[model samples]
Target chain A: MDIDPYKEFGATVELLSFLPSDFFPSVRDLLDTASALYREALESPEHCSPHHTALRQAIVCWGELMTLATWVGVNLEDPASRDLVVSYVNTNMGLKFRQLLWFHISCLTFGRETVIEYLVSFGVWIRTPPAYRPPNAPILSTLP
Target chain B: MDIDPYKEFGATVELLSFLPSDFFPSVRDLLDTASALYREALESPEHCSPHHTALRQAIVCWGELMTLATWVGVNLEDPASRDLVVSYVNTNMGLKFRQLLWFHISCLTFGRETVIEYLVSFGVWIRTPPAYRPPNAPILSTLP
Candidate 1:
């Protein structure tokens, strides 16, 4: 089935509300970087690097969140709103990470059954206890 | 000099406003396709074709014009707005074309100039043309 990765990615980001507050700074940095890269790409295509392209895609999801937050009168510059923005961006980062990983795995496997198996393995990777996983477990497992 | 290719591309699209009103629908359709393709690529990275990527980049310029028009409250869905949108898109397309050409020429002749050149070119492209030019010339050249 043709999946709408954006919708899936969006849903995953929405789930970030459940995460702890300590991760906000990293998420904020990612969103800021992604927004910068996307703006740069729009302003100057010749200077675009792979990092910029990846960040641009990541920013789009984050941008949508920011736009929504802004529309709802969230004071993003304030500490509280900043915190929320960070959380939103972090959640989006998680979604992008998972999507990219899935894209790569699908390319490597190149068949529906193989892809399905890879997804099952991915689920197993997520289901494993956090203590046994790598330090980036939270960010890593949240991919759809 | 670094160049901002996307801005240049946008200027090129805007330049097309010089064409007769009758020519707009076809051009607008093409621009829409480019816009749609970019959105598709962003929404579905796995299925993104090379052509879509190229089209996406190209469409960025067109998107800028569309954004400007929308910002100015151009009713693009209406017949009057459709012409305006097409004209705006055309002007930007011209600027983009020039920027791409200049970038290639610079690459072949000079090397990577900074994105500044492209941005400057876009600025120049959007300026009002000299009075001696065709009546429609300034319509395409004038910036918002």
Candidate 2:
């Protein structure tokens, strides 16, 4: 776990050099194709098959990536990328899907705590002094 | 992107309370099943089929998760968890599979740099006073 920041940064830049400006669009197209296949499977099986099940699972894989990205983005200092992600997810995903997305987000929320715990344990992340409050305090109640 | 740390921590603990002690074991069992299914598809298709292809793609999804976990684990200050993950992956996966896993890791490496840049831009993470090295410096070259 001893990371040399300089080396990591160098390796990352080398990798980034290989990615095209269209990488995001290329991945978007891939997701679209996967979505189309899933819809086709739904109509045919009215009806299901192993491939159909696979397609369904495949879409969930994409959803997991998006969910994780949003989680990470939300935690970062800047809101711009997080806003873009949330806006895109809210616009494109139905309410049910958004709720499902939250299930993924919830898992990530737990993960974040565990990692933070790990960091705090090792002194990698020092928490600032803040007045204590009940963990169960409602979000709405905290708003001024 | 605004998060209430106390509330998030509370929600996370509630979620954790709901999770069983065997959650990791349960997820391990799930991955085992996925691996078994992929192996079956491989033999039958000796054998090319859509389901076969899907299973192949599906396994890659698992690989991506493991790869991401390793990436995250390795970056954390503690070495124990990262050691466990690396040991498991090395023991269980073939060399080619491990190499393929690096492709996923490489993408994550770039993602990490970008997120760091975001945090640095906003003064969320302050870099330490380490002497700079050339970006293209080789890893082995830096090791004493």
Candidate 3:
């Protein structure tokens, strides 16, 4: 079966656009492309990017996604999707710290609400006192 | 000045007690002990743990702290004092995936209300269809 690259890219782009405004266009573009490629490869077993092309593209996309997710303040992998993406990127392409940071922010903006809910449920906001509290404890809450 | 390692350990332990109920005490104990050793080295200005030891200790502590912080849904970096703590941990110790995840979650939970407010002020929410609006949109407006 012939796979449509543009259609794949469009699907991924639509998903990526759902992300928050903090995502960098550059990072999103890379992720959309990578996701499209991956989808294409999966749909059409005979079509595959060359090893170097695959690796480079994966690294560019995944690295930026991870970094952009971080930059925009979303924790992508409470359910392990982010880690899976990183592993795929690393095995297929190559992961770099700079690229990861950039993409982390992108993904973060892309899935801000889901990410925030995950964080809240994960208890990341434990440091902040409960929004509603007794009056007498104001001093402790105000401490810092 | 003679620094009591136990005192430092106790301080960290106290801070860690704020962690959610599910935190692994064993790991927390390890972190406290490691942090104590590192603190002693710093205070004495003498032979401390090797470079690797320092690095490992910091990483371990960061991981533990981040785990705990995430469990409690707290943003340690938004408030000045909390950010100081985060900076101290990041500078003196290394951050791992666990720690970074925790940090990301904290930032999201703490920032969620403010972000929604900003979006609403800009009329973004008005244009967003109710079905498409975030699940917790109502709660955000109610937040102090």
Candidate 4:
């Protein structure tokens, strides 16, 4: 059976409320890099049409992340609201949903899944992850 | 010299303030379809890692579109704030920037550029655009 993409995406947004503030900076960085790369791709005439699919997906992914960040910002501003958000998710499908949310969020923040996988594939610029760094390369700390 | 992707994206968000409320629902539907397709791709283990680059791009694009929608929503709620917003963009680089904004926004709304080009390439499902339809496509119209 096919899953309803809209419903699933909405559920993930709710799960974002459970995340702490520190996650905020990394997501911002990811968004920044992704945005720059997408614009770069969109501007080049040759690049635009050829890589249209990747660029389109990147925009959508960016939108989803933005939605996630918006939720986090709103909830942080109102702790009381966070409690209400928790109740909504917990009441609906607590454990199973959280498990799914945790898995996806980990990929988002830790693995840098979408940004690395989708945006980078279009030949837009991004630094290599630390694990794959060359011995002589300068060490830089950023989102893993 | 390279353009600052982050700064450019911020400028576009401001441009969104000038859009009308009628644009909202179409953007919403675009978001819904894009979100669903993204999740579908993410779940298939083979699809997830292999299409990581495209998926990542899609997410970023989605985030951008979401940002546009959010700006529109907020401005709609406060016409007073929009007056302030107009001052911000109009003062910065008025005529040249609006021309650029008009070009991109048209592609986003009318051309349906990103979603069609990026997500469709991943082999995920989307109704064909009417302009290219096989007449057999049930004569359906969604986002042009």
Q: Which ten residues in a row have the lowest lDDT in candidate 4 chain A?
A: A1-10
Considering lDDT, which of the candidate structures 1 and 2 is the better prediction for this target? Answer: 1
User: What tens digits encode model 1's per-residue C-alpha lDDT throughout B1-144?
Assistant: 123223322333333333333323444544444344344444554424323333333334234334433533432234664565445445644444433433333333333332334445434544546563344322211145
Q: How accurate locally is residue A36 in candidate 2, as Cα lDDT from 0 to 100? A: 44
Error of 2 at A85 (Å): 14
**Candidate 3 lDDT tens digits, A21-55:** 33234444655654554434323323132222222
Put down candidate 2 lDDT per residue, B8-109, tens digits, no spaces. Answer: 111222222222232223334434544543444433423243334334444545555465555455544657645664555444333223322222222233
Off by over 4 Å in 4: A1-25, A35-38, A43-79, A82-144, B1-144
Question: Which candidate comes out best when scored by lDDT?
Answer: 1
The stretch of ten residues in a row with the least summed lDDT in candidate 1 chain B is B133-142
Whose DockQ is greatest here?
A: 4
Superposed Cα deviation of residue B67, candidate 2 (Å): 0.9
Against the native complex, each candidate's DockQ, computed on alpha carbons, is 0.07, 0.03, 0.01, 0.10
lDDT for every model?
A: 0.39, 0.36, 0.34, 0.37
Q: Report the CAPRI category for model 3.
A: incorrect
- Supply candidate 2's per-residue lDDT for A91: 47
Summarize candidate 4's per-residue lDDT along B28-124 as a digit string, tens digits.
3443544554445544333233133343333333343344435544535556655654444334323323333233333434443442343234222
Candidates 1 and 3 compared: the better one by DockQ is 1
Which residue pairs show backbone clashes in model 2? A45-A48
Candidate 2, B-chain TM: 0.29
lDDT of 4 by residue, A31-111 (tens): 454455454554333323313333333333434333443554353455665565445433332332333333333343445
User: At residue B33, what lDDT does model 4 achieve?
Assistant: 46
